[PDB]
Inverse folding.
């Protein structure tokens, strides 16, 4: 499913992401925008052979099991396919573990490179939340 900006912001809010670990809803929406373009079915393979899954592009080497990444840690205890669902619950629960991991949202290269230090509030502007 390809989420709309405000539609996604409200779903994340409901799932307790706004201000989770101090990151605003704007940060999370901006990150999903540049990570997957709001598409839950997005996947991208990396050179190390691992693959990124879903709206937040969660990596298979550490967080999920896709059965084809040697030495996967599967820290979120879920098959990577669950991350491509139209319901964002699994992606959100896993993202919560990642963001608490110590490096915060810097774990997401698109957030670091395109959201960090920007007017992220613009991403939820106009939304009835």
């Amino acid at each position: 499913k390809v989420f709309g900006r405000c539609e996604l912001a409200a779903a994340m809010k409901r799932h307790g992401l706004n201000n989770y670990r101090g990151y605003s809803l704007g940060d999370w929406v901006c990150a999903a925008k540049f990570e997957s373009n709001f598409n839950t079915q997005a996947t991208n393979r990396n050179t190390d052979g691992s693959t990124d899954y879903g709206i937040l592009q969660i990596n298979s080497r550490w967080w999920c099991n896709d059965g084809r990444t040697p030495g996967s840690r599967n820290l979120c205890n879920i098959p990577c396919s669950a991350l491509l669902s139209s319901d964002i619950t699994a992606s959100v629960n896993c993202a919560k573990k990642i963001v608490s991991d110590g490096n915060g949202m810097n774990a997401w290269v698109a957030w670091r490179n395109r959201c960090k230090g920007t007017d992220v509030q613009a991403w939820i502007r106009g939304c009835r939340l």
